[PDB]
Symmetry: C3
Subunit: 95 residues, 3 copies
């Protein structure tokens, strides 16, 4: 499993969220942040199975891209376990 | 060492914080976030020794759980080093 | 590549940002958070090449340190890939 953390322009959030839901993303966490003299940005975090990482990365790139400076970056971070709070399910059963 | 990132319902924050302090957690970072059409959630991050991860996970699950949809998830992420800013202490000496 | 996540006192943000830019940091993401009964803190995230991690850690420690309790902590988290949204560049080409 991997955590995909993407920092994008705020106005791109609904489009990116819609695109991710469309390819099957079940959950996502959004944080208001600032970055680069700081400009507002939106952080999106999604945790997915290893075999789904590339599709998510390409979907975020294609949907959040404007071609202008400041479009943002995506970081792929390893996740060793995932636990669903409601049920105690883990790993594959919790994504 | 591992970072435990948990996304929980906002009203569960004081209970979860109290439960974590009770089992010995020295520090925690809380961020206001939104998730799933987005609903407010609270992100808690705690970095702990490998041998303390399971106790923290079980404590968050038991305290944040309501049995209803939206209870949240917990992600376990590897941390290669930890540094205490005040002293420069690292690793085991900084947790 | 590694993600350096530092939680610091809010008033230290401009100094730390200036110090990081000075040693060559191209980008950084800042989040308003609370921590420890919670006090406001600022989270800074920077993703850098492995050979630049120590310089960044020392720069944050030296600039954010006051010697008083609450100065904060720095976590070093592995990053498996980085993607520049504007161009699709990855890894070394995206930092
Ligand atoms: N190295 C980094 N570490 C942490 N956060 C970063 C880093 N680089 C970028 N970010 C985050 O991504 C946001 C958008 O950055 P940005 O789109 O400018 O990337 P870039 O390297 O400048 O490529 P571009 O030429 O398209 O601007 C930054 O404001 C910051 O929030
Ligand atoms: N895959 C994910 N990636 C990133 N964040 C997630 C992911 N899944 C859940 N979250 C975060 O956890 C929050 C709560 O999710 P939630 O409790 O609905 O998990 P779930 O999979 O729906 O299980 P449940 O059936 O109990 O709802 C979401 O709003 C989001 O902020
Ligand atoms: N173990 C931890 N897990 C997650 N976040 C932490 C942890 N420890 C500290 N933090 C974050 O760092 C912030 C500042 O902590 P702090 O400076 O008090 O570290 P410390 O261990 O108490 O060392 P000091 O004696 O200098 O206070 C905390 O408020 C919290 O936001
Ligand atoms: Cl992380």
């Amino acid at each position: 499993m991997k955590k995909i953390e993407a920092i994008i322009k705020p106005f791109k959030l609904d489009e990116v969220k819609d695109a991710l839901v469309e390819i099957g993303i079940g959950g996502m966490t959004v944080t208001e942040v600032k970055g680069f003299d700081f400009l507002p940005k939106v952080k999106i975090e999604v945790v997915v199975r290893d075999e789904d990482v590339e599709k998510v990365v390409e979907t975020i790139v294609k949907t959040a891209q404007t071609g202008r400076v400041g479009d943002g970056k995506i970081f792929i971070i390893p996740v060793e376990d995932v636990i669903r709070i409601r049920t105690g399910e883990r790993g594959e059963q919790a994504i």
